[PDB]
């Protein structure tokens, strides 16, 4: 089997993106965020406290005839922006651009923290990382991919996030036609859970190319790149104007500079970021000074290739017996 699925940015900023999915008979549509630095599918319901509620879409498993709790687990979460959701479980059907899971984990938040209700657009999480970090107690579950493996043509997904435009997820083969060149894969540690994997350098602009091991993880549901400190100075050092500024929280940039591109090395290969994909726009509304796209990872404990990197390339998270990830140019 595969499955085929548009994913959209939820605004003019490619924050994030959502992509539709079907849950429980008859469907209900949501929009989920896939996220392959987590490995929960969680969902606003039903369940979820009133007051936390502004605008998603909910699940209600009392209206699926599929739907059936999974008797005493719970769950809860904590991302890596702060952000946090918790509730029990069920399981039901579950379909993505045309791939079935059944019996999969939902998990239904009783509660989610501000951020996630300031956010009307995303409906809940899809978990694309190892099922080994899944959160549900006392029996962990797994992915949708996980689940759905065995069954799919490849044991693979796709992600090709747009710049400003929709973009697609596919699970189950990989479109030749949706990158030019090749496909350089390389490997991956599952570790810590993630798709983690070592860049072999950078280059900024039309500057060389410099050779470093660069140790992180490719995970979408994150919006910028966090880079080590030294490799972000070395970028901003190249706009005129742009500093770090503790009170707002990262380098800024002035909003009249043009940003140079960011390149990435995935082995002898070498994936290029416009400029642009690095401009996150006014502070706060009406400000001449940009938020930048690429940030440090310094306190973070890991570098992460975000959708600003991520979304410059083809990415193939191939599932097979030894994971590895696969990038091309597009």
């Given at each position: 089997?595969?499955?085929?699925?548009?994913?959209?940015?939820?605004?003019?900023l490619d924050?994030?993106?959502?992509?539709?999915?079907?849950?429980?008979?008859?469907?209900?549509?949501?929009?989920?965020?896939?996220?392959?630095?987590?490995?929960?599918?969680?969902?606003?319901?039903?369940?979820?406290?009133?007051?936390?509620?502004?605008?998603?879409?909910?699940?209600?498993?009392?209206?699926?005839?599929?739907?059936?709790?999974?008797?005493?687990?719970?769950?809860?979460?904590?991302?890596?922006?702060?952000?946090?959701?918790?509730?029990?479980?069920?399981?039901?059907?579950?379909?993505?651009?045309?791939?079935?899971?059944?019996?999969?984990?939902?998990?239904?938040?009783?509660?989610?923290?501000?951020?996630?209700?300031?956010?009307?657009?995303?409906?809940?999480?899809?978990?694309?990382?190892?099922?080994?970090?899944?959160?549900?107690?006392?029996?962990?579950?797994?992915?949708?991919?996980?689940?759905?493996?065995?069954?799919?043509?490849?044991?693979?997904?796709?992600?090709?996030?747009?710049?400003?435009?929709?973009?697609?997820?596919?699970?189950?083969?990989?479109?030749?036609?949706?990158?030019?060149?090749?496909?350089?894969?390389?490997?991956?540690?599952?570790?810590?859970?993630?798709?983690?994997?070592?860049?072999?350098?950078?280059?900024?602009?039309?500057?060389?190319?410099?050779?470093?091991?660069?140790?992180?993880?490719?995970?979408?549901?994150?919006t910028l790149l966090?880079?080590?400190?030294?490799?972000?100075?070395?970028?901003?050092?190249?706009?005129?104007?742009?500093?770090?500024?503790?009170?707002?929280?990262?380098y800024?940039?002035?909003?009249?500079?043009?940003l140079?591109?960011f390149?990435?090395?995935?082995?002898?290969?070498?994936?290029?970021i416009?400029?642009d994909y690095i401009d996150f726009?006014?502070?706060?509304?009406?400000?001449?000074?940009?938020f930048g796209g690429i940030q440090?990872?310094?306190?973070?404990?890991?570098?992460?290739?975000g959708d600003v990197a991520?979304?410059?390339?083809?990415?193939?998270?191939?599932?097979?017996?030894?994971?590895?990830?696969?990038?091309?140019?597009?």
């Amino acid at each position: 089997s595969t499955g085929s699925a548009t994913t959209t940015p939820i605004d003019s900023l490619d924050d994030a993106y959502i992509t539709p999915v079907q849950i429980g008979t008859p469907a209900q549509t949501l929009n989920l965020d896939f996220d392959t630095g987590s490995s929960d599918l969680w969902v606003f319901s039903s369940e979820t406290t009133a007051s936390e509620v502004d605008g998603q879409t909910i699940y209600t498993p009392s209206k699926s005839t599929t739907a059936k709790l999974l008797s005493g687990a719970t769950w809860s979460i904590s991302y890596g922006d702060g952000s946090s959701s918790s509730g029990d479980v069920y399981t039901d059907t579950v379909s993505v651009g045309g791939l079935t899971v059944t019996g999969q984990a939902v998990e239904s938040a009783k509660k989610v923290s501000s951020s996630f209700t300031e956010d009307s657009t995303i409906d809940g999480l899809l978990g694309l990382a190892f099922s080994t970090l899944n959160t549900v107690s006392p029996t962990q579950q797994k992915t949708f991919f996980d689940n759905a493996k065995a069954s799919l043509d490849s044991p693979v997904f796709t992600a090709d996030l747009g710049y400003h435009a929709p973009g697609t997820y596919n699970f189950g083969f990989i479109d030749t036609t949706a990158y030019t060149g090749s496909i350089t894969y390389t490997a991956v540690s599952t570790k810590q859970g993630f798709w983690e994997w070592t860049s072999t350098g950078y280059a900024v602009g039309s500057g060389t190319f410099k050779s470093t091991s660069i140790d992180g993880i490719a995970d979408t549901g994150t919006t910028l790149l966090y880079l080590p400190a030294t490799v972000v100075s070395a970028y901003w050092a190249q706009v005129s104007g742009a500093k770090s500024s503790s009170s707002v929280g990262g380098y800024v940039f002035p909003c009249s500079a043009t940003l140079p591109s960011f390149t990435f090395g995935v082995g002898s290969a070498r994936i290029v970021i416009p400029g642009d994909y690095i401009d996150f726009g006014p502070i706060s509304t009406g400000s001449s000074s940009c938020f930048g796209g690429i940030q440090s990872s310094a306190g973070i404990g890991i570098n992460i290739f975000g959708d600003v990197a991520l979304k410059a390339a083809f990415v193939v998270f191939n599932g097979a017996t030894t994971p590895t990830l696969g990038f091309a140019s597009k």
